[PDB]
Amino acid sequence: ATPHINAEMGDFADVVLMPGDPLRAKYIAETFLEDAREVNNVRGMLGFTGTYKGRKISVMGHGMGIPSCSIYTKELITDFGVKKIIRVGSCGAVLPHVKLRDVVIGMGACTDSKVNRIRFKDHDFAAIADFDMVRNAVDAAKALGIDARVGNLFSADLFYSPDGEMFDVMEKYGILGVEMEAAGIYGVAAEFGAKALTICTVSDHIRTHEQTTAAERQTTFNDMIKIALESVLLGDK
Amino acid sequence: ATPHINAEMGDFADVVLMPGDPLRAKYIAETFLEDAREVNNVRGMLGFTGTYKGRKISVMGHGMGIPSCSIYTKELITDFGVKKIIRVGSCGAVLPHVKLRDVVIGMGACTDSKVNRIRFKDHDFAAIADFDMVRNAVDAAKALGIDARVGNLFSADLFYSPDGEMFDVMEKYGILGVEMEAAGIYGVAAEFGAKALTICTVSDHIRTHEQTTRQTTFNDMIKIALESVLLGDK
Amino acid sequence: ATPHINAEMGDFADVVLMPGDPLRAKYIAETFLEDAREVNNVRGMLGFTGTYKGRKISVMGHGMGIPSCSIYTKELITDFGVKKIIRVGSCGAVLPHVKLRDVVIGMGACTDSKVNRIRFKDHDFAAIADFDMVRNAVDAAKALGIDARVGNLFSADLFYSPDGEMFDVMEKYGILGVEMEAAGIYGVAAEFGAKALTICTVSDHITTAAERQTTFNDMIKIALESVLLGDK
Amino acid sequence: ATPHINAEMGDFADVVLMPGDPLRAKYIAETFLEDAREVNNVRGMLGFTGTYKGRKISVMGHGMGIPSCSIYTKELITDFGVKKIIRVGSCGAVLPHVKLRDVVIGMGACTDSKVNRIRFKDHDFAAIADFDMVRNAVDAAKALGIDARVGNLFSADLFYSPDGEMFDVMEKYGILGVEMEAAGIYGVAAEFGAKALTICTVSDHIRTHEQTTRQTTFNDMIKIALESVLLGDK
Amino acid sequence: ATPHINAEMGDFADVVLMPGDPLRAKYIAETFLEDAREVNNVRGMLGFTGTYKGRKISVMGHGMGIPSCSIYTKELITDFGVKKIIRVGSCGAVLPHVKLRDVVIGMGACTDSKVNRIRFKDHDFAAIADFDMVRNAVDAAKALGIDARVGNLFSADLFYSPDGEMFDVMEKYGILGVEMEAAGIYGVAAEFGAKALTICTVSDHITTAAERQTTFNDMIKIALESVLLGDK
Amino acid sequence: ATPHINAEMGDFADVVLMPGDPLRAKYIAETFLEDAREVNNVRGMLGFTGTYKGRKISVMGHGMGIPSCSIYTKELITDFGVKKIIRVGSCGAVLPHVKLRDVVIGMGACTDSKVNRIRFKDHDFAAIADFDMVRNAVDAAKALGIDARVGNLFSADLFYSPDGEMFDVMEKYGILGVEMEAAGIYGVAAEFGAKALTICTVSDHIRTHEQTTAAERQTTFNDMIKIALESVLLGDK
């Protein structure tokens, strides 16, 4: 066990899906995994392990922010033999053409944080996902009849920013989705030699700040989970 | 209700104790508050409101890291009329004269986060607590016969730091405890106009590696916090 | 028409291959393109436009360094309607498993330059390529029976850096190759809404001339065939 | 003798009050100390030692700016056994509720200087005062019936700032006074292992432009400082 | 011999004039030097060594940008024994009193690049020229009845900057001209203990071709005559 | 008058020599100026005005550090019509070949301070002296049979540096002298449109940390003052 995870080697699959909300990990295990069992509960960060079409899969929340998810992903990789981390969350949109419910894939992730500069001798480290994982996700989505956008995400330290001028900048440079973990998870994956990918569903459009129907929203979120789970199967081949 | 808190104005007291662990807040509500009522569970971030010796008080977790607690402390202050925030967490020690379960009070908080530089034109903003609250905590500790050092805390973005050498620099400058949110709460208190204080319990020693896997001294911290608000009311 | 390219709209294809060495532009034009014609000569940066299996293609050097290539890529995009930029160059490897003559594809590009911070309010902008272009290059490579590594490049401002330990850091974080333009082209593409990709061959690990020419022609075929896959 | 102080161990008391103006130190030595003896005049930086109600005390100017006071506070601490440094200076106000001659106590000090980043690996070091000294000053003020706000000061490198907008940011974050050395003295106290406190008198208002061209409230500041050491001795 | 210059010790004079445009090196060699011979052609960066009034002089382009010129100036200094580097180029002016075709001499060079911070532990390194070289250029100019302004240049990494207000700042602090290499060459000279100087002619204010050629030849004569004054 | 200078327009010459030590300004006025009168004393920063061979000259201390001298030089220029500022101080040497008593002229000045970054939008402002003033000083020195070195100075914020590694860096990049004001005075001169020059006498060699005889040291310091005063006369022509 670690100070944040009360499990032992073997308790997690070598692939872990990670939502920000611990209650969403439980929701994913309940909805898509067969014979899922809770393998962690410290600080209430629920983790589960079960099978998806016979494949051993794990899903655990990572909390909000780079500092939070950096702790969990780091421990999964070094102490639980986890090779892949697939973040499945929500994000806000700044581009007029990026619509509510669009599925975004973060090939790269820009950031507000100083963590990668601390890692990269104060220079610019391009926080990127694992290419194969990106490709598997794109292909899985195509098979589901879904067209995911692949580009940059922006991982913020302040959900409530003081200088609202950053949104124009994000939009100017083509940022697809705004969230809070991608850049940190990619930094961890690179530092400890593992593979990661962040997929998000647009739950808010900053240009119009909205949400829309709930049934349709829940549908897209599930497609996103489906895309994540199906993508690991393509990777297995 | 706010984006991360499903409650209404009035559900929270004007003072809120906040541990990083939502399960610790539940424990505090059950062990120290009377008529405790759960007022939030969004994302599992348990929040409670009750009374301590007739004083209405709340306790809610804020999660790990500056980005997490910034969201919660902000919504409480702008939408629930919270005047005082008292973080009650754990920390790692770097100084040799600091032992497990020791109580530290961060009158100040250093950090490797950029949040305050983003707020202060890229200059040095000294993330400090409210002086009265510090004084209150010190007096409360004194009256309870519990020891407590007052000084600088270090709020880290990375629990697993790739720069181990920075611990020597922290030690060289007298850092009492290494935690992950004080500097962010102080920055929020300042930006949104409220007051805050961070009290921590040494739960691990970065040099010796001896660590906990809680309570008691964690109960002391709570007593000091709860008793300090009462002094503040008078 | 532009300060560094004496040509007019239409002279360049919407896709432009760009080597660092200007002399390589003519080699590519004569060796891989049909009906090539000269479209630029300013400062000796020769540009050519021709066709590859019917597809309109242009080729012109960009010079060494982020500042140089940022000028050309920018002008091509805003004044000649270029949609995609494919940089085809060389790099140095810091990883033991990455060998001489290997073909590296930069999905991302780190850098010690300050250009992107100037663009992104002093924050971290992840300089990245277009995903489809990356995927096209990979598939075009496999079709040619060539195994290409996809990952991060490091775009250096100083070829002769005084900081020797930075190479160990690059190795620790999996940098595939060290060159000097990727991060700059990716920033320009982002700033002006175009697509870019950097392909490099390992020409030094931190070979015969015939071996070098073979690998160079392989990189060009890959880039050219990737463009065709992109059109589908 | 040190590079900038021609004195020997023992010439200074373990506590030293320090204004930026050498002529103010002379005034303090002549108005509040008995048997005042000049112990330094190198570069005109007048230093004096005497007694206040039987308590041995020194007062020496430190000049304007972080670079100047860093030299003096350092030599005093490493070569003359000075344990406590109490800066008694002037400052400019940005807040509307702050008037001339008001007394401010910097429990913390923000800055646009790089000195602390050079010491703290380019991270945010919270330049704070010694809690006991702050508390001492507060009690002393209380007993003397003098008002005093406790909080953050802003130590500027450029008195004539080209970034006027930074004053709005200072005001937004509750800066009590704009001065030029607190953050540097706190950094030195920390690096060389001593204690320090900065007390200031509002001598100018950056918004209204009304300003002084001293004493009295400048006499209050001195009383608070001298009386605070006595409380500290007990 | 070096990665970017196929020459050997002795091929280059201890003094090298360097224009940004590579094509200008041959013009200078044929127009101002006696008995010129070719000493480099790698990447099309032609270098020549000849003599001016008996004094041994070399000329070769450096490309656009700090990264490009940093490579050439460095190699020339550490492998070909070059003692002085005189960059002769063009720049844009932000000051109203500085006119088109004016000759500007950069005693100092500001920059938005990060190379010198990387060299100077993230602090402020004042990138400056050799004082004697500056004084020589001034005196050589006066002898030619030419009035040259001495001051600060600004070495930009991005010719097309997204920050429009930086030009007002440059004007406020007296920047004489905007170009892209001075600060990089000055850093290299400092790092490897050599001497450097940047001379520029105002080719744009933020003219006929005959006017341009006249002023260009004036800058070259100035540089060449300054070298002779330096030998005294 | 200003909050730091109790004088009125006319009290200072349009040229001001400035030593760090206020007691040294008095020494300079006494030693080289005819009919010098004290024109300032607030905070004890003595200022004087007199004539050198018939030319109206002023000399006033500027205190230690960039923040200190930035206040004085700024007020001299904007409120007292001063056109030129000639700093005359001492510095430490890091280069083995730069010897005790050498006269150094700061054509440029490197710095530890953040003041010029605050002025120059966070970029690199090359803090330089006025060319003509440098030339006049070099020529005046030649006339005195003195050979001054012209190059970069380093203006430090911390006389007592924590990371002693900066001296190797300074030496590596050819820094001639180490002091504490040049970069700040040049920044002020550029911001308010005036002319400045810093000249220093090496009073310490960091590689050997020494001083030597006192008579000879005092001789070189005076030559430096002579060079400064004589240089303004050449400038007048």
Ligand SMILES: CSc1ncnc2c1ncn2[C@@H]1O[C@H](CO)[C@@H](O)[C@H]1O
């Ligand atoms: C401006 S809209 C927005 N902004 C920032 N984060 C968002 C946003 N929308 C969804 N997320 C992500 O969810 C958490 C913060 O609520 C975080 O876990 C984060 O990833």
Ligand SMILES: CSc1ncnc2c1ncn2[C@@H]1O[C@H](CO)[C@@H](O)[C@H]1O
């Ligand atoms: C090196 S020991 C250490 N390091 C960092 N944070 C620690 C530490 N010990 C306790 N905490 C605090 O608790 C959470 C991280 O477990 C965070 O909420 C944090 O405040």
Ligand SMILES: CSc1ncnc2c1ncn2[C@@H]1O[C@H](CO)[C@@H](O)[C@H]1O
């Ligand atoms: C340390 S080995 C190395 N380092 C940097 N750049 C290299 C390197 N090898 C090839 N290139 C690329 O070629 C040019 C610099 O020669 C540039 O165009 C650059 O892309």
Ligand SMILES: CSc1ncnc2c1ncn2[C@@H]1O[C@H](CO)[C@@H](O)[C@H]1O
């Ligand atoms: C904008 S008003 C202002 N600004 C900056 N410093 C001030 C100010 N007022 C008083 N001081 C302090 O006194 C000296 C500068 O005069 C310095 O010692 C400084 O601490």
Ligand SMILES: CSc1ncnc2c1ncn2[C@@H]1O[C@H](CO)[C@@H](O)[C@H]1O
């Ligand atoms: C805003 S006008 C301008 N800006 C930047 N560089 C200029 C400029 N004018 C001439 N140069 C110099 O020529 C090359 C860039 O064209 C580079 O070699 C450069 O030195």
Ligand SMILES: CSc1ncnc2c1ncn2[C@@H]1O[C@H](CO)[C@@H](O)[C@H]1O
């Ligand atoms: C390491 S030797 C050294 N270091 C720094 N400053 C020196 C030095 N020597 C002379 N000065 C200058 O004198 C004052 C500091 O004593 C300051 O005014 C400064 O200009």
